[PDB]
Amino acid sequence: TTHYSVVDKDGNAVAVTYTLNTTFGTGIVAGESGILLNNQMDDFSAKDANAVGPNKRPLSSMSPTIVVKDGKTWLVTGSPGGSRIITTVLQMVVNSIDYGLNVAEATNAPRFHHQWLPDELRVEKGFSPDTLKLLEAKGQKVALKEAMGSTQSIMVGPDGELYGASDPRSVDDLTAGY
Amino acid sequence: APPVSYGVEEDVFHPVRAKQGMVASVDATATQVGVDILKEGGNAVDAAVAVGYALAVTHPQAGNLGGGGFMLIRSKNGNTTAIDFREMAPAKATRDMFLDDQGNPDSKKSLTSHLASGTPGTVAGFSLALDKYGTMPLNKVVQPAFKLARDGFIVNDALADDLKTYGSEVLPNHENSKAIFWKEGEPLKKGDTLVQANLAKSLEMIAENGPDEFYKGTIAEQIAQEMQKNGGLITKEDLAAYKAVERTPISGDYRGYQVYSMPPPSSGGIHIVQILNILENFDMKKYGFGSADAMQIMAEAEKYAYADRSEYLGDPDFVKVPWQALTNKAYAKSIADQIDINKAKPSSEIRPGKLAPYE
Numbered sequence: 137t138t139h140y141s142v143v144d145k146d147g148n149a150v151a152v153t154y155t156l157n158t159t160f161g162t163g164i165v166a167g168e169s170g171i172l173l174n175n176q177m178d179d180f181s182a183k184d185a186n187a188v189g190p191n192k193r194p195l196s197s198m199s200p201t202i203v204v205k206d207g208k209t210w211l212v213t214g215s216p217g218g219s220r221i222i223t224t225v226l227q228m229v230v231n232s233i234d235y236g237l238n239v240a241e242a243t244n245a246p247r248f249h250h251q252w253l254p255d256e257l258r259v260e261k262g263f264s265p266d267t268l269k270l271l272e273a274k275g276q277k278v279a280l281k282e283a284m285g286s287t288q289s290i291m292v293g294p295d296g297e298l299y300g301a302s303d304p305r306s307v308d309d310l311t312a313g314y
Numbered sequence: 315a316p317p318v319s320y321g322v323e324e325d326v327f328h329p330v331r332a333k334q335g336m337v338a339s340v341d342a343t344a345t346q347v348g349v350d351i352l353k354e355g356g357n358a359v360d361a362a363v364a365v366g367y368a369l370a371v372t373h374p375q376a377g378n379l380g381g382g383g384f385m386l387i388r389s390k391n392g393n394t395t396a397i398d399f400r401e402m403a404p405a406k407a408t409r410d411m412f413l414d415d416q417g418n419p420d421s422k423k424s425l426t427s428h429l430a431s432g433t434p435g436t437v438a439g440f441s442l443a444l445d446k447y448g449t450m451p452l453n454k455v456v457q458p459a460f461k462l463a464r465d466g467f468i469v470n471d472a473l474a475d476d477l478k479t480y481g482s483e484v485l486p487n488h489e490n491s492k493a494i495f496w497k498e499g500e501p502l503k504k505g506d507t508l509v510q511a512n513l514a515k516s517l518e519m520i521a522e523n524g525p526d527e528f529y530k531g532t533i534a535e536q537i538a539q540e541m542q543k544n545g546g547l548i549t550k551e552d553l554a555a556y557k558a559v560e561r562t563p564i565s566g567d568y569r570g571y572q573v574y575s576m577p578p579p580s581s582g583g584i585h586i587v588q589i590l591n592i593l594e595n596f597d598m599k600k601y602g603f604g605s606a607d608a609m610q611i612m613a614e615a616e617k618y619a620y621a622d623r624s625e626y627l628g629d630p631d632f633v634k635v636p637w638q639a640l641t642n643k644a645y646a647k648s649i650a651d652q653i654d655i656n657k658a659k660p661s662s663e664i665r666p667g668k669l670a671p672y673e
């Protein structure tokens with residue numbers, strides 16, 4: 137899965153998340169077309185609502201998101217990462233609104249995640265040992281796991297100044313403008 | 315809601331800065347394609363489509379013509395819309411199609427066989443967007459990707475590493491995939507040139523004939539044949555029937571901000587809004603980034619949301635999703651009132667919420 141964000145000079149904005157499902161999907165190219173085919177059917181429940189059926193779209197966590205401030209587009213964001221998309225995007229929004237972090241600070245900040253089942257508070261590297269011990273004392277079951285997400289985000293000043301951040305978790309990515 | 319920071323020189327992490335337009339993506343080349351479209355006078359949709367076609371060439375990991383996805387668009391005048399171009403199951407798809415002899419899911423069947431594929435929506439969704447909200451013809455926005463496919467580009471670390479790690483598992487197992495992504499019996503590595511002549515043809519013919527090339531034309535024939543000869547389900551009828559769906563975005567108010575995200579069949583947008591609704595009852599700024607307290611409240615709020623997620627979501631063309639009840643702020647308060655900052659509630663005691671009072 138991958139996410140990209142665009143803002144133009146007129147203040148129009150677009151957030152796209154799109155995917156083959158897994159990396160390279162099936163690995164099958166369709167004959168002589170040069171096109172790799174998705175394995176999106178895995179996103180159905182194999183064994184009620186998200187069961188496989190004809191002409192149906194399998195549920196996806198993909199969440200291209202646009203936040204509006206004082207009447208204007210203000211944050212454009214999104215990410216790959218399956219169910220973790222929800223918490224990755226949520227942390228972008230919370231970081232920007234509640235903690236007053238610039239789009240790059242919000243992006244490079246460490247991420248945590250609780251998806252109810254498994255019953256664990258999943259963390260990346262970067263939270264204080266003092267804080268994690270406190271969370272354990274509160275009842276949380278802390279689980280240090282691999283990096284989550286690849287946010288590609290644009291913040292927009294009321295004056296049209298643009299501010300962008302590519303995820304450190306993805307190499308060879310780029311945010312650029314003119 | 316406290317003051318926002320756009321960035322100062324004193325910060326550790328610095329945003330990229332621009333005055334006119336900007337593009338953020340997983341791939342430098344595709345990002346640059348998008349910026350150049352904006353430079354030439356294209357609008358955000360024009361550039362978004364160009365970047366999407368670019369990634370289909372430069373980021374074969376996930377950028378695609380053979381998959382699908384979601385787009386959110388907000389126009390300068392404040393109209394916000396969603397385009398759903400998620401893949402559709404073939405007409406011949408069946409409930410138990412992934413079960414083996416013993417009634418157990420066969421993971422490989424739904425991942426690496428021809429039955430794993432849904433009817434691709436990307437080309438449809440991009441053209442729905444371009445035709446309604448763009449300013450440039452498809453031929454112009456596809457041209458950058460066309461050139462990258464025909465002429466090739468240099469493999470970087472990201473693509474090389476993905477080819478070796480994930481690519482090895484699926485690509486060389488098939489003659490025609492191996493012919494593109496492997497060279498002399500090993501994956502293309504950093505510094506090699508990846509040329510995609512067949513993909514260039516596909517892109518050339520899409521540019522010339524429009525999205526019908528993918529859904530009804532030569533590409534459609536190539537997909538259908540690949541499926542027929544190899545035990546897959548996607549037919550020419552499936553491809554001709556495919557339609558991308560414009561939908562109303564889910565939205566919420568969070569501390570005076572309006573948050574728009576992807577509605578069903580996204581299982582995410584509704585719950586970002588729901589979790590924000592729950593969090594609005596707490597003074598998040600007071601606890602601060604990376605505090606036990608903030609992380610506790612958010613972890614607990616997330617649990618309830620994920621429990622609802624497991625129960626109430628579906629393809630909205632097939633089921634009625636109680637999105638109004640899930641994004642209801644009284645419901646969110648009822649959840650907030652259960653959260654104990656000093657004691658995590660075990661997930662075993664958390665169930666999908668009773669929605670009837672909020673419907």
Ligand SMILES: [Ca+2]
Pocket residue numbers: 302303304305306307308309310
């Ligand atoms: Ca990066």
